[PDB]
Amino acid sequence: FYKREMFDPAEKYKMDHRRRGIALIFNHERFFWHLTLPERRGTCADRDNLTRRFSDLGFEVKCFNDLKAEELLLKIHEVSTVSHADADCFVCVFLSHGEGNHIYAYDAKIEIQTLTGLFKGDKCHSLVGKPKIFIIQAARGNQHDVPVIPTNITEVDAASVYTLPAGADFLMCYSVAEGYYSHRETVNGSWYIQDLCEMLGKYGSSLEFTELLTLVNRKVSQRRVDFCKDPSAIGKKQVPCFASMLTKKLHFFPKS
Amino acid sequence: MFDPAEKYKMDHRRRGIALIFNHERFFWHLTLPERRGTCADRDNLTRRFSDLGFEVKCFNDLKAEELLLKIHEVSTVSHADADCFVCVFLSHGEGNHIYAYDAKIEIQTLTGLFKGDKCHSLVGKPKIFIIQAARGNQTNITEVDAASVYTLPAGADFLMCYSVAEGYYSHRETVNGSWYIQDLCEMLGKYGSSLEFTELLTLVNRKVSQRRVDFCKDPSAIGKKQVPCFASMLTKKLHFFPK
Numbered sequence: 247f248y249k250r251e252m253f254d255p256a257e258k259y260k261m262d263h264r265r266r267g268i269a270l271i272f273n274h275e276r277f278f279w280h281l282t283l284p285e286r287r288g289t290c291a292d293r294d295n296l297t298r299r300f301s302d303l304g305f306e307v308k309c310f311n312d313l314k315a316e317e318l319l320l321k322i323h324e325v326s327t328v329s330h331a332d333a334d335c336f337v338c339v340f341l342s343h344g345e346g347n348h349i350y351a352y353d354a355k356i357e358i359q360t361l362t363g364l365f366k367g368d369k370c371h372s373l374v375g376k377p378k379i380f381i382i383q384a385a386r387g388n389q390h391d392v393p394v395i396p397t398n399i400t401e402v403d404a405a406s407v408y409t410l411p412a413g414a415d416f417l418m419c420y421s422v423a424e425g426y427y428s429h430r431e432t433v434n435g436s437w438y439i440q441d442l443c444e445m446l447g448k449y450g451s452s453l454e455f456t457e458l459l460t461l462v463n464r465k466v467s468q469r470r471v472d473f474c475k476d477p478s479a480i481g482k483k484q485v486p487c488f489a490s491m492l493t494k495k496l497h498f499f500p501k502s
Numbered sequence: 503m504f505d506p507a508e509k510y511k512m513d514h515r516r517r518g519i520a521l522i523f524n525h526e527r528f529f530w531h532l533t534l535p536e537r538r539g540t541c542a543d544r545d546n547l548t549r550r551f552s553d554l555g556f557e558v559k560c561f562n563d564l565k566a567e568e569l570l571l572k573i574h575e576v577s578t579v580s581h582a583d584a585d586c587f588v589c590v591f592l593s594h595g596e597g598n599h600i601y602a603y604d605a606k607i608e609i610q611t612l613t614g615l616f617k618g619d620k621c622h623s624l625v626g627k628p629k630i631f632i633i634q635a636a637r638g639n640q641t642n643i644t645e646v647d648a649a650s651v652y653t654l655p656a657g658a659d660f661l662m663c664y665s666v667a668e669g670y671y672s673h674r675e676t677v678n679g680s681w682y683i684q685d686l687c688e689m690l691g692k693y694g695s696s697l698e699f700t701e702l703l704t705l706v707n708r709k710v711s712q713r714r715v716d717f718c719k720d721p722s723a724i725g726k727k728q729v730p731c732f733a734s735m736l737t738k739k740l741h742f743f744p745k
Contacts, residue, residue, distance in 0.1 A: 257708070410668070411729075413669070414729045420655075454701075460737065468737075489653055490704065490731060492707065493704065493712075
């Protein structure tokens with residue numbers, strides 16, 4: 247027996263490289279005053295949660311806190327230009343505010359297509375044909391703070407970031423879709439990241455990853471705020487989504 | 503309790519309605535080119551979705567007012583006895599709009615008719631939109647159109663399926679039909695009644711993105727790759743097992 251080159255409806259990405267790969271986490275808790283954006287209490291919990299879960303799946307996790315845009319671009323360009331020949335895949339997470347096709351760094355916004363474009367085709371040959379997974383927790387910062395230099399509560403932010411696709415073998419994962427609202431607990435973290443991390447821990451090492459993101463869709467879209475705390479948040483449902491350009495099934499079975 | 507393998511309940515009396523809006527030519531004032539090959543797509547889709555148990559209704563070259571009337575009529579009948587709902591658009595598009603014969607319609611208007619508060623009997627059921635629409639260029643020939651329609655999400659339990667993503671190109675053969683629709687239909691025919699539907703759409707991503715654009719008959723088209731995508735808001739696994 248051998249596998250002839252016939253179309254296989256069950257084909258999986260090859261995940262038997264020496265290393266799982268790098269997972270970058272860009273964590274943004276506060277912003278330059280000229281941006282008029284509120285701080286994001288709870289994001290440090292998200293960052294730590296994600297680090298534990300992706301480390302357990304075999305990723306080399308690198309976190310960066312509150313980088314300026316020039317610094318962020320430098321760092322992500324450095325990762326896009328090294329060889330990933332010995333890696334299975336690549337993960338990039340943004341924890342911030344966003345608007346349209348932009349995510350905010352500390353001092354300025356950056357276009358999502360600029361960040362994903364660094365990993366397309368022969369800009370990053372050693373990731374061609376490998377999953378490139380971007381996870382974005384970014385929505386509209388509520389701006390009732392001034393344009394001047396300056397307990398567990400749930401903050402509710404309108405969806406603002408477009409659910410953009412990218413190239414072949416990219417998977418773009420969004421905390422919330424247009425017309426819905428993103429939620430973050432100031433001590434426990436974001437609804438989306440909490441539920442993503444819980445599902446990674448329970449099922450990440452077995453379930454196909456888009457099947458796992460569908461579980462996250464279900465968990466998040468079924469959450470509600472306590473009515474006695476913030477009646478304002480009634481009817482502000484959160485529905486995540488993911489935009490898949492993947493071409494094979496993706497698993498994170500423990501590496502041998 | 504939470505079941506990591508939970509499936510949509512697909513044991514209703516009927517599979518449900520599949521609507522297909524098929525646009526081959528446009529009012530002259532829109533200055534959009536004809537879409538030869540689209541009738542093949544329509545026929546292919548009708549067969550595949552019929553075989554999966556759907557009640558397929560096709561509409562050719564409706565005006566926007568006619569199209570809105572029809573999709574509104576469908577959104578207000580009871581789907582209580584149905585598993586799910588499918589809507590296919592075969593046209594040109596731009597941004598958040600798809601073209602009818604005489605005018606643009608916003609995708610969010612069309613999907614909004616099937617949100618929970620407007621269509622109670624589809625609550626918690628899959629609502630699947632499949633969009634073959636890109637930028638009209640203003641024997642079997644292959645036409646190549648730049649991506650133009652945003653890969654928009656919708657509400658819970660919607661699945662939005664696009665023939666092409668930003669930066670890539672959609673292809674249509676004047677005899678054989680659209681690349682995306684051909685490969686979607688081949689996969690439906692072979693695996694539609696067994697495979698989880700997003701796993702099937704992933705196969706379609708692979709098939710379409712592997713179609714070679716190295717040596718076209720039209721030198722203009724060289725290197726203009728096609729990559730589809732789908733945006734899922736589903737909350738459970740979706741299968742179309744024979745009823």
